[PDB]
Structure 1
Amino acid sequence: MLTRLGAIVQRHLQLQQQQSDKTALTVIRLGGIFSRRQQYQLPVNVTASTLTLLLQKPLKLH
């Protein structure tokens, strides 16, 4: 069932990356006094440790 559940997740994530233009990813701004523009993720919106991130135009990595 593990090799069969991966095909369901792959099919589910395939339909979510097609409509990714509706919900993008806005990062909060907090560049105060530091040698580099630090960033931070979303607060209560995301709480998982190993979360996934989708992309629009696919690239050939590795």
Structure 2
Amino acid sequence: MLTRLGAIVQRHLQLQQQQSDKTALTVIRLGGIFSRRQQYQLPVNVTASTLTLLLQKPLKLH
């Protein structure tokens, strides 16, 4: 069922990456009295130890 569930997630994420221009990712720029800024990821929107991310223009990695 793992090799079959991956095909369902692949088909589900295929229709979600086509309309990914509605909401993107944004990291805060904390400063005030501090040096280098901090970087983080999605908050409670992903309740799992392995979160997923979608990209607009696909590239050839590895």
**What TM-score do the two structures reach when normalised by structure 1?**
0.77
Q: Which runs of 5+ in 1 are unaligned?
A: none
Does the Cα contact within 8 Å between 1:28 and 1:41 map onto a contact in 2?
Answer: no
State the shift of 1:39 in Å.
1.9
With 27-36 and 50-59 compared, the bigger mean Cα shift is at: 27-36
Structure possessing the higher relative contact order (Cα contacts under 8 Å, 6 or more residues apart):
2
Identity %: 100
Normalized per residue, which structure has more strand? 1
Per-residue deviation, residues 8-53 of structure 1 (Å, max 9, x unmatched): 0000001111000001112122134554332233444444321011
Aligned residues: 62
Is this contact kept in 2: 1:17–1:55, CA < 8 A?
A: yes
- In structure 2, the gaps of 5 or more residues are none
Q: RMSD across aligned C-alpha pairs, in angstroms?
A: 1.9
Distance 1:42 1:51, change over 3 A: closer
Using the size of structure 2 for normalisation, the TM-score is: 0.77
d(CA) in 1 for partners of 2:33, 2:44: 25
